[PDB]
């Protein structure tokens, strides 16, 4: 029987930069809530789950995931420099996923500390509706009290230990400032609420509570972001902000159910809401390994209820998993339980076949809450044979933790989604798994394809034969083999053996030696013997076909194209281009947001090396970009001729 009720639960995570005072803020939050990937705690008869967000925002896959894991967030800002480039890249994401937010402006105690300023940024840069529900008294050294607007009280801080908080009444000389502040607080909520609009102008006095009811309505619908203040290190306003999480930030019931499809048709939205009556469904957001307990698979349960020792479906991988004991990491402790209801988070011990992104649901049902390709790759050189063991070991494990990377042993070669991605991966090896290894330069991974069609035949004279029709496929369509054979001059016995020989012979590539893609092959005819003909020769044939095809099909080299989104001051807006159009980029569409323009562009990854270093140098620290894969494109003849000569 659950200690806490959905209504009493808060799933949160902390969106902050490092110099915003992130780590220092998390601990205070863990401490005040005490007595990691995810931590269970409590504040005031409320279950509080603090979800660890990724260490860098360039990892989109994670941040997206951790956002769906959580319900609402606490954004931490520096009291001086206001918001910063990445925090907003993440903020907009938060909104795409409809994550309620409250804002805690930290590090008030320092220099250049400007509260009424930092607040501006959310307005100016993020175009966000946010108004202080509190105001400071003093700044820098002078920082002393905090005015709570909604209840109209004040609190004095006599120590840096966060004890003996004097709860006092608002001093005169700040009385006015307090007054227009609460007044300026009460509408920003009212732009949203209706009857409150009358009540404002109509002059009716607004209650403390009835006001609270109103805000928490704005924030849980994310039309308003409450804003707070303090210094985490000196223990000021941390508690008030904790209360704030209780008052405003959503329970699992106050947000909209997570979308997902079923196991066969993945076009149905299947609803997952928090119901203990309904069938259990959950998502695994983290996997690590303890020296003692073994593999830990962390998870959140959106719908249904779960118990220790029963069986569950791992829906993503298509198998059956037997729940071991369930654990809960607390601040300082670990505690075991036999049951997981909805809206809750716990780790599971000894689930053999599970990995990050995997959806666990009940036995009967079929549901999945989540759904990859290398554009860039590295060479890795282990020393002697001593290290080489440990690496190849790691590679097996790492897959389970991050499926988003590829394994190639042909030296060993790992492709990934980017230089940053690949590094953390190498990071994890060099350090955590202790391998000493030479590491190459990032290299674009090119492809190949056919610009035209043809019909050809390989025949291996030990005898094998095929007639295949090779045609350029739709860009992105991948590879689809069609078996058109009828009479059986080629018997089924060797038929899939052809498909293999093709795949394998294409992977090698016909031009510079890069994998062959976007190509249709159809097998319309052949000739077989009954003694000599072997599954081998029927490979050598398919391969042979490919070689002849390569001669008639006008093969071409493909390079990756990225979707580059810049944002900048329009004084430089000409520059970024003469830059882009020097990069073989082309600019498609643009839209303004607030006082800056968002430039959308398409650029070859090959031309994108050292871009951030030319973004700042031109715009003087003002510009910011994002990038991700879009499509493969045909390399220009002059460039392509070189890649050939190289690999030759």
- Residue ranges for the known binding site for GTP are 16-23, 52-56, 106-109
DSSP label at 205?
Answer: P
Q: Give the count of alpha carbons within 13 A of 612, CB side only.
A: 5
Residues listed for the chain = 648
Do the strands 130-132 and 225-229 form a parallel or antiparallel pair, or are they unpaired? parallel
Q: Which of 607, 508, 623 is nearest to 573 (CA)?
A: 623
Cα–Cα distance, 68 to 282 (Å, whole number):
11
Contacts of 464 (CB under 8 A, 6+ apart): 494, 528, 533, 534, 536, 537, 538, 539, 540, 541
User: What backbone phi and psi angles, to 5 degrees, belong to 443?
Assistant: -135, 125
Q: Which of 444, 512, 520 is nearest to 481 (CA)?
A: 520
Complete domains list, the chain, with CATH: 1-256 (3.40.50.300), 257-371 (2.40.30.10), 372-448 (3.30.70.870), 449-559+631-648 (3.30.230.10), 560-630 (3.30.70.240)
Task: Classify 261 as helix, strand or coil.
Answer: strand
Cα–Cα distance, 316 to 367 (Å, whole number):
8
The pair of structure tokens assigned to 550 is: 């390569």
CB-CB neighbours of 596 under 10 Å:
18
Q: CA angle 30-32-34, nearest 5°?
A: 60
Contacts of 55 (CB under 8 A, 6+ apart): none
Which single residue is written with the structure tokens 């073994």?
294
Cα–Cα distance, 511 to 567 (Å, whole number):
39
Burial pattern 132-157, b for ≥16 Cβ within 10 A else e, equals bbbbbbebeeebebbbbbbeeebbeb
Is the separation of the CB atoms in 499 and 523 below 8 Å?
Answer: no
Cα–Cα distance, 412 to 392 (Å, whole number):
9
Contacts of 9 (CB under 8 A, 6+ apart): 46, 47, 48, 49, 251, 252, 343, 344
CA distance readout (Å), 49 to 39, 52, 74, 510: 6, 10, 12, 54
CB-CB neighbours of 637 under 10 Å:
9
CB-CB neighbours of 250 under 10 Å:
23
275 burial class (0-12, 13-18, 19+ CB within 10 angstroms)? Answer: middle
- Residue ranges for the known binding site are 16-23, 52-56, 106-109
- The residues pairing with 303 across neighbouring beta strands, listed in sequence order, are 281
Q: Give the determination technique.
A: X-ray
The pair of structure tokens assigned to 392 is: 């190849």
DSSP label at 510?
Answer: S
Phi-psi region of 620 (alpha: psi -120 to 50; beta: other; left: phi over 0): left
């Amino acid at each position: 029987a659950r200690e806490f009720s959905l209504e009493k639960t808060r799933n949160i995570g902390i969106i902050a930069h490092i110099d915003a005072g992130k780590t220092t803020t998390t601990e205070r939050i863990l401490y005040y809530t005490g007595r990691s990937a995810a931590t269970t705690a409590a504040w005031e008869g409320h279950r509080v789950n603090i979800i660890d967000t990724p260490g860098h925002v360039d990892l989109t896959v994670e941040v997206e995931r951790s956002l769906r894991v959580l319900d609402g967030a606490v954004t931490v800002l520096d009291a001086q420099s206001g918001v910063e480039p990445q925090t907003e890249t993440v903020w907009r994401q938060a909104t795409t996923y409809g994550v309620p937010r409250i804002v805690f402006v930290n590090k008030m105690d320092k220099l250049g500390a400007n509260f009424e300023y930092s607040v501006s940024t959310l307005h100016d840069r993020l175009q966000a509706n946010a108004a202080p529900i509190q105001l400071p008294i003093g700044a820098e050294d002078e920082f002393e009290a905090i005015i709570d607007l909604v209840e109209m009280k004040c609190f004095k801080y006599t120590n840096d230990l966060g004890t003996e908080i004097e709860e006092i009444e608002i001093p005169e000389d700040h009385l006015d400032r307090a007054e227009e502040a609460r007044a300026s607080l009460i509408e920003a909520v009212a732009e949203t609420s209706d009857e409150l609009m009358e009540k404002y102008l109509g002059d009716e006095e607004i209650s403390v509570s009835e006001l609270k009811e109103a805000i928490r309505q704005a924030t849980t619908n994310v039309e308003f972001y409450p804003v707070l203040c303090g210094t985490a290190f000196k223990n000021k306003g941390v508690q008030l902000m904790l209360d704030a999480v209780i008052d405003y930030l959503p329970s699992p019931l106050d947000v909209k159910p997570i979308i997902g499809h079923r196991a066969s048709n993945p076009e149905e939205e299947v609803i997952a809401k928090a119901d203990d009556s309904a069938e259990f469904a959950a998502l695994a957001f983290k996997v690590m390994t303890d020296p003692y307990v073994g593999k830990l698979t962390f998870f959140r349960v959106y719908s249904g209820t779960m118990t220790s020792g029963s069986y569950v479906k791992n829906s993503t991988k298509g198998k059956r998993e037997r729940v071991g004991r369930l654990l809960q990491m607390h601040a300082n402790s670990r505690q075991e339980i036999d049951t997981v209801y909805s809206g809750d988070i716990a780790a599971a011990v000894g689930l053999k076949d599970t990995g990050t992104g995997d959806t666990l649901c009940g036995e009967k049902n079929d549901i999945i809450l989540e759904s990859p390709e290398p554009v860039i790759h590295l060479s890795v050189e282990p020393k002697s044979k001593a290290d080489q063991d440990k690496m190849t070991q790691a590679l097996v494990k790492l897959q389970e933790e991050d499926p988003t990377f590829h394994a190639h042993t042909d030296q060993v070669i790992i492709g990934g989604m980017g230089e940053l991605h690949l590094d953390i991966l190498v990071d994890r090896m060099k350090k955590e798994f202790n391998v000493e290894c030479n590491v190459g330069a990032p290299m674009v991974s090119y492809r190949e394809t056919f610009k035209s069609s043809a019909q050809v035949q390989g025949k291996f004279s030990q005898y094998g034969d095929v007639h295949i029709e090779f045609t350029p496929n739709e860009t992105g369509a991948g590879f689809e083999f069609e078996n058109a054979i009828v009479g059986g001059v080629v018997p089924r016995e060797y038929i899939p053996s052809v498909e293999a020989g093709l795949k394998d012979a294409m992977e090698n590539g016909v031009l510079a030696g890069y994998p062959l893609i976007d190509v249709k092959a159809k097998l319309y005819d052949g000739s077989y013997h009954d003694v000599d003909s072997s599954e081998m020769a029927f490979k050598i044939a398919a391969s042979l076909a490919l070689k002849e095809a390569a001669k008639k099909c006008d093969p071409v080299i493909l390079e990756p194209m990225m979707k580059v989104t810049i944002e900048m001051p329009e004084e430089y807006m000409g520059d970024i281009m003469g830059d882009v159009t020097s990069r073989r980029g082309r600019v498609d569409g643009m839209e303004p947001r607030g006082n800056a323009q968002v430039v959308n562009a398409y650029v070859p990854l090959s031309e994108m090396f050292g871009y951030a270093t030319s973004l700042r140098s031109n715009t003087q620290g003002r510009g910011t970009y994002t990038m991700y894969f879009d499509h493969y494109a045909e390399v220009p003849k002059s460039i392509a001729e070189d890649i050939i000569k190289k690999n030759k």
